[PDB]
Design a binder for this molecule. Structure first.
Ligand SMILES: O=C(O)COc1c(C(=O)O)sc(-c2ccccc2)c1Br
Length: 297
């Protein structure tokens, strides 16, 4: 039902119970590679690991492990790589993964420092003149430009495979005002930011999967991906009522643990999708409305 369901859940105020049921039903696969002693320093959180079956393997002989999951949505025909915020020792692996998986876009939904603590290494360069070289993976990364808005920033980077001397443009979409364990300001703020990613071409089938991360790579990242997938699904069918959000989330959780972290995050997903349906179904206007409502200037 979607909008009828949302308002049935609001009416009773049963969002916690709906969310817990999803947690109850969720898939549980081994994360044996992630739990190997030699990988302990490659994981940011003890209890957030990628399942062996869907994990991204680095193309080296030495240690192919990264805390990263491929979310391959078959019906939707879109994939995402959900990963944790890279650590000081895994920034090289991060860019290796981006290179090997032919990703064009990186979506970052967290701040480097949140609530006094460092949720993510400084993995991209903050100034044109001070490029980064990742010696372990032989990659160079250069800030090409940045367009700073009120609550989000878009950065052009150039990624270079130092071995082959091939270079790629990576688009970096940094949402700076999404609180950990929280939700965006409004559906408008969120949708405005999602459509920026969309409009960049980063989600094209002709590219590798977009890399999405926050700190753990499941809460805010899960929320972002659910909404995008639900919108794509109804887009393909031009049929909002054919989307079962909880069923999509459950499908998503086959590929990485714990996607969406609070009941309110789930409630926001419903919100964002219901509002986003307006554009999908032929309302040009709402895109301009979101932009205004988001106060991006
Ligand atoms: O993305 C979010 O909303 C919350 O993400 C986060 C964390 C953070 O950003 O500090 S810690 C965390 C978490 C870590 C271990 C177990 C269960 C949850 C998650 Br999940």
């Amino acid at each position: 039902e979607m909008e009828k369901e949302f308002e049935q859940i609001d009416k009773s105020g049963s969002w916690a119970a709906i969310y817990q049921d999803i947690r109850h039903e969720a898939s549980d696969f081994p994360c044996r590679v992630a739990k190997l002693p030699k990988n302990k320093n490659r994981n940011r959180y003890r209890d957030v690991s990628p399942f062996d079956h869907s994990r991204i393997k680095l193309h080296q002989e030495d240690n192919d492990y990264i805390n990263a999951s491929l979310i391959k949505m078959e019906e939707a025909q879109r994939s995402y790589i959900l990963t944790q915020g890279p650590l000081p020792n895994t920034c090289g692996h991060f860019w290796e993964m981006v290179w090997e998986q032919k990703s064009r876009g990186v979506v970052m939904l967290n701040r480097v420092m949140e609530k006094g603590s460092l949720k993510c290494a400084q993995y991209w360069p903050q100034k044109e003149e001070k490029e980064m070289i990742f010696e372990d993976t032989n990659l160079k990364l250069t800030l090409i430009s940045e367009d700073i808005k009120s609550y989000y920033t878009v950065r052009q980077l150039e990624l270079e495979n130092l071995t082959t001397q091939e270079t790629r443009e990576i688009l970096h979409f940094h949402y700076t005002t999404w609180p950990d364990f929280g939700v965006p300001e409004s559906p408008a703020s969120f949708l405005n930011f999602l459509f920026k990613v969309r409009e960049s071409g980063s989600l094209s089938p002709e590219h590798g999967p977009v890399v999405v991360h926050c700190s753990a790579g499941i809460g805010r990242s899960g929320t972002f991906c659910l909404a995008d997938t639900c919108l794509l699904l109804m887009d393909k069918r031009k049929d909002p009522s054919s989307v079962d959000i909880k069923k999509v989330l459950l499908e998503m959780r086959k590929f990485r643990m714990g996607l969406i972290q609070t009941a309110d995050q789930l409630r926001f997903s419903y919100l964002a999708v219901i509002e986003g349906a307006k554009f999908i179904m032929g309302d040009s206007s709402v895109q301009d409305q979101w932009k205004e409502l988001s106060h991006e200037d």
